[PDB]
Structure formats: structure tokens, C-alpha cells
Amino acid sequence: YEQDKTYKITVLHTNDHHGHFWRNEYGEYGLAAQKTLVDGIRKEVAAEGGSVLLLSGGDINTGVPESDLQDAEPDFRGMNLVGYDAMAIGNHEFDNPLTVLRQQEKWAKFPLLSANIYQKSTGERLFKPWALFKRQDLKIAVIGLTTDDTAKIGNPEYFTDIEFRKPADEAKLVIQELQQTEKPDIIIAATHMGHYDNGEHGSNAPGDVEMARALPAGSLAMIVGGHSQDPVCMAAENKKQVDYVPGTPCKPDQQNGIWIVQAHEWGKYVGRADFEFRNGEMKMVNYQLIPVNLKKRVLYTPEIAENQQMISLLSPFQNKGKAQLEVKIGETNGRLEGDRDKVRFVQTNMGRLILAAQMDRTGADFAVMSGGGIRDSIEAGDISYKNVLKVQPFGNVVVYADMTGKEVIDYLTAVAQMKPDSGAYPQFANVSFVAKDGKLNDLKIKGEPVDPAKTYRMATLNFNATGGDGYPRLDNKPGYVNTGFIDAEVLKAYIQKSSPLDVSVYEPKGEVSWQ
């Protein structure tokens, strides 16, 4: 770089896109509006003589039927047109077989990076640890890191000959490899690790804050994060704002001299970190989260028109995905009861089917949900995704919690207090008991009495886990995991691999009763 030269570098970033290539029902977000915004900032910065780098914290896959059904092809192609420079590989990039991820890599014109994912048998990295970019005469290195909880979470399916090594330890090695071989002027890490207040990751794998603290002070200009899905805007030292409001100031976190940022999820924001580099020092001059047509429905900020080129590119995928919703995914030999006056009074086969799908996705031992969360029945016969979405129309997310036998007792006793004839009435799976005077007698999980000294995994929805319907909160306790899997997708996928469904398998036989 030139001595005494001041370079202006703008780093734009997004993360946890999760299939949101299209605008939602309220005209919010989508990649067509993102394109207009990013093109605009590039024009602005080009005119100021600066440089732009657009990075993704990963998790492009999974979360919207039209995307999921096409293996996120529209999302990666859309990202090509928005012009991403690089992306960190996220844990959801492994929801599909490696063949699909390699296909996504072929689609993407930008590198999919990760320094810590290794092939077990050879000890060699599966992907590139970093990408180098020339901007003016600066050499900028972007390293990628992926959470090492990836293969440990839920019910893992595709990690044949693959392992995830500790991200923070790999970052130390990678930074040193780069300094000794490339001597980049600036190093930024795109990570899919999570931002936890004051590094309080709990049962989750250590994330961005603990890593920044472990690295040499200021060794990275910034960590462009993801996974935890939060707009990282600080209210107080080591404390993220709760209920951050679109369009308001956003102070990114700074730990051990390293800036840590995150733009929430689904293309809701494009983070913009404006830096000035001169004689080796990287100074953040400005930071903001720029909403992409977010609404409270009224806009918070100026409406961003959807780029026509993006709409023409994405429309066929949107249309094809919508039409695919009509297609038969399975069949049932009997009506699956989801009617309100049944699911709010007694255990039903639809409740058992949904919970069976959730336990299967999460590796859970038992599960529960509110009868009020089942919104329709499915008649005997063919089943389409469209049928599934009417049963599960609200996009609740499947989550699980590992708990002690004692906690299970306390948890189920509390939930059993929810009365029939209310949306809060519970649908259970793999739970049996007779409730008498607020007490649960002969309590069993999978036919075995509960052992206070054992650990059990329970599946449910985020709605319930965070206290919905008066259920005990699980989200703020260790062992909690929000999987990011949407209720409808989990049910559709389970029905699809399980069909033809013999519904007698899901018929309640009095496992739980009240008297």
C-alpha cells in the first residue's frame, strides 16, 4: 500500500438469508430490493473514490418453501447478481447432501469459505480457508469460519468423513498462515458462530466474542457474523439491544479491538461498516444497519425499489416453487384430525404426526406443542405441501431442549395444567401419565418412568419455548437450541419420507389422561 495514503473501504454484510430470495407478503426485504440498495451504495462509494466488499455470514439454505424445494438455487444466483464477494459456510449449508453444497458452490460466483471444516481421513480442509481481494493497491484477506456445533446439533445426517474443528483455534492458525505468506493489509473474518452478550455462549459452542478475546488484540479489522440471528447493536457494554428498531442507530460490538457485527437474518438489513485504512491502521468511521423495506404496515426508512433484473432472474424460481406446492408429497390412509374442537380437547393423530416429525428432526425423546398451533386437518388421500402449510401456516420454528429428569417432571407438570377447550391445551408425544390434583402420576417418557438423574431431549416450537401460551420458558436455559427449521418443512419432509402413511401408527391410546 502507499505510505501516508488513506483508503476508504466500505464493508457491506448480510447473514442467515435462509431462503428469503423473494420479498415477503408485506413487501419487505427480498434480493431485488437488496440489489437496488447495494448497487446504490457501490455508486456512492465509487464516486467518493472508495472500495466496497460485500460479505455473507452464511446460512443461505433452508427456511422458505420456494427456495428449499430448489435447493436455494434462486438465492445463490440472486447473490451473484447482488454481487457478493464471499460467504462463510453456515451450519445449514449441511442440511442437504454434500453433492448439493458442491452444486451451490458451482452456482456461486463468489467463494464459499471455511477454514475449520476438515475431511477426517486426510486431515485436509474441505473448502478454502480464505479469499484475497485487491482493492486499490490493498490486499484484503477474508477468512471463513463455521460453528463446530454444526454436526452435533439435532439429528445429524450428512457428515460422512467430515469434522468441524474449533473456530477460534483455527482462526489463530489461519491469521498466522496469512501473515507469513500473504501479509494481507487487512484481515476480516466472515463467521457463522454467533454473538453472545459478553461471550456468554452457555451450552452453545464458543462464538465471536470469545474468539475475538482469544485472538491478538486488533488482529482482525472485524468479524462479520451470523448464526445466532441478531442485529448486533449494543445498548450497553457487552449487552445487545433487545428489540432493536429498524432505522435507529446501531453501535456494533468491539471486543479486544475487533469489531463484531451481525445483520440479523433473512435479508432484513444490509450492514454497512465504513472504514479508513492508512499506514496499517484500520479505523471504523461509521456503522449502520440499513433496513431493506422493513415495515412495522408502514416503512421505517425510504422505500427501496426492486431491481427489475433481479425480478426477472428470480420470478421463474418463485413461480416454479409456488406451483410445486400443489404436488403430492405423500398420502395417508385415514383423516389426520387437526380440527380445533378436537386438538384443544384431546390428543389427536395429527398432533402425534407433527410431534413425531419434530422429534425425528431434532433427535428428541418426547415433544409437546399447543393444540392451538394445529390449524387444519388433512383428509384421507394425497397430501401436498399446500395441505401441510394450512395445518402449519405460521412459520413457528422447531427447537429442542436437553433437560434433567427433574426438569422434565417440573416442565410436564406445569404444561399438564393447561385446560382443555383452550389453545394452550397440550399435544404430547412419547409422554404418558394420569394427572390427579395438579400432580402427574406414573409419569413415563417412552414407556419408562422418568429418572431425575437422566437427560432427556424435548422438541417443541419457539412459540412455546419462549413462553407462548403460558408454557415454562426454555429459551433462556442452558441446553436450548433453536434449529432454524420451520414447522411446515419439518412436517412436509417427514410425511414425504414416511409415505404412504399408516395413520393407525399415530393414534393416541390413552397415554395421558386427566381426572
**CB of 193 or CB of 391, closer to Zn ion:** 193
Residues after which the chain is discontinuous, using a C–N cutoff of 2.5 Å? 296
Of 13, 23, 59, 148, the catalytic one is: 59
Let me know if 59 is a catalytic residue.
yes
Q: Which residues are CB-neighbours of 215 under 8 A, at least 6 positions away?
A: 168, 171, 172, 175, 256, 258
Burial of residue 504 (number of CB atoms within 10 Å: 0-12, 13-18, 19+): exposed
Show binding-site residues. Answer: 16, 18, 59, 91, 192, 227, 229, 340-344, 463-469
* Position among 91, 204, 387, 396 found at the interface with Zn ion (CB under 5 A): 91
**16 near Zn ion, judged by CB under 5 A:** yes
Rounded to the nearest 5°, which phi and psi values hold at 131?
-135, 145
Q: Which stretch binds Zn ion (CB under 5 A): 11-19, 254-262, 413-421, 439-447?
A: 11-19
| Calpha distance 165→149 (Å, rounded) | 10
Q: How many residues bind Zn ion (CB under 5 A)?
A: 6
Rounded to the nearest 5°, which phi and psi values hold at 311?
-60, -40
3-class DSSP assignment, residue 409? helix
Of 23, 201, 344, 361, the catalytic one is: 344
Question: Closest separation between CB of residue 325 and Zn ion, Å?
Answer: 23
Let me know if 192 is a catalytic residue.
yes
Show binding-site residues for Zn(2+). Answer: 16, 18, 59, 91, 192, 227, 229
**CB of 91 or CB of 191, closer to Zn ion:** 91
Q: Cβ atoms within 10 A of the Cβ of 442, count?
A: 9
**CB of 147 or CB of 432, closer to Zn ion:** 147
Q: Which residues between 152 and 191 bind Zn ion (CB under 5 A)?
A: none
Sign of the alpha-carbon dihedral angle for 220, 224, 230, 234: positive
Of 227, 264, 272, 352, the catalytic one is: 227
Quick check: 184 and 135 in contact, CB under 8 A? no
Question: Closest separation between CB of residue 262 and Zn ion, Å?
Answer: 11
Q: Which residues between 375 and 404 bind Zn ion (CB under 5 A)?
A: none
Let me know if 91 is a catalytic residue.
yes
Which of 475, 497, 477, 494 has its CA nearest to residue 485? Answer: 494
113: left (phi over 0), alpha (psi -120 to 50) or beta: beta
Question: Closest separation between CB of residue 86 and Zn ion, Å?
Answer: 17
Q: Which stretch binds Zn ion (CB under 5 A): 84-92, 94-102, 104-112, 426-434?
A: 84-92
Let me know if 102 is a catalytic residue.
no
Which of 374, 380, 372 has its CA nearest to residue 420? Answer: 372
* Position among 90, 206, 231, 321 found at the interface with Zn ion (CB under 5 A): 90
Q: Which stretch binds Zn ion (CB under 5 A): 14-22, 154-162, 215-223, 329-337?
A: 14-22
Q: Which residues between 477 and 496 bind Zn ion (CB under 5 A)?
A: 484
Let me know if 68 is a catalytic residue.
no
| Calpha distance 166→397 (Å, rounded) | 27
Burial of residue 213 (number of CB atoms within 10 Å: 0-12, 13-18, 19+): middle
Let me know if 227 is a catalytic residue.
yes
Question: Closest separation between CB of residue 202 and Zn ion, Å?
Answer: 16
Residue pointed to by grid coordinates 374442537: 341
Question: Closest separation between CB of residue 486 and Zn ion, Å?
Answer: 12
Alpha-carbon distances, residue 298 vs 25, 145, 242, 263, 295 (angstroms): 13, 37, 21, 21, 5
**CB of 100 or CB of 311, closer to Zn ion:** 100
Let me know if 375 is a catalytic residue.
yes
Let me know if 195 is a catalytic residue.
no
Helix ranges (DSSP H) in 108-220: 167-181, 208-214
**CB of 84 or CB of 428, closer to Zn ion:** 84
Let me know if 18 is a catalytic residue.
yes
Of 125, 375, 382, 482, the catalytic one is: 375
242: which 3 cell numbers?
433487545
**CB of 27 or CB of 363, closer to Zn ion:** 363
Helices H / strands E in the chain, number of each: 13, 28
Helix axes 349-362, 487-498, angle to 10 degrees: 100
**CB of 170 or CB of 407, closer to Zn ion:** 170
Of 13, 20, 77, 192, the catalytic one is: 192
Q: Which residues between 199 and 238 bind Zn ion (CB under 5 A)?
A: 227
**95 near Zn ion, judged by CB under 5 A:** no
Helix axes 98-107, 73-82, angle to 10 degrees: 30
Of 13, 92, 272, 361, the catalytic one is: 92
Let me know if 197 is a catalytic residue.
no
Q: Which residues between 42 and 61 bind Zn ion (CB under 5 A)?
A: 59
Question: Closest separation between CB of residue 193 and Zn ion, Å?
Answer: 9
Of 15, 16, 396, 457, the catalytic one is: 16
Question: Closest separation between CB of residue 16 and Zn ion, Å?
Answer: 4
Question: Closest separation between CB of residue 60 and Zn ion, Å?
Answer: 9
**CB of 14 or CB of 460, closer to Zn ion:** 14
3-class DSSP assignment, residue 208? helix
Let me know if 4 is a catalytic residue.
no
**CB of 13 or CB of 227, closer to Zn ion:** 227
Alpha-carbon distances, residue 354 vs 342, 351, 358, 400, 467 (angstroms): 15, 5, 6, 14, 20
Which of 214, 89, 221, 213 has its CA nearest to residue 150? Answer: 89
Quick check: 304 and 293 in contact, CB under 8 A? yes
Question: Closest separation between CB of residue 59 and Zn ion, Å?
Answer: 4
Q: Which stretch binds Zn ion (CB under 5 A): 12-20, 198-206, 230-238, 317-325?
A: 12-20
Residues near Zn ion (CB under 5 A): 16, 59, 90-91, 227, 484
User: Where in the sequence numbering do the catalytic residues fall?
Assistant: 16, 18, 59, 91-92, 95, 192, 227, 229, 340, 344, 375
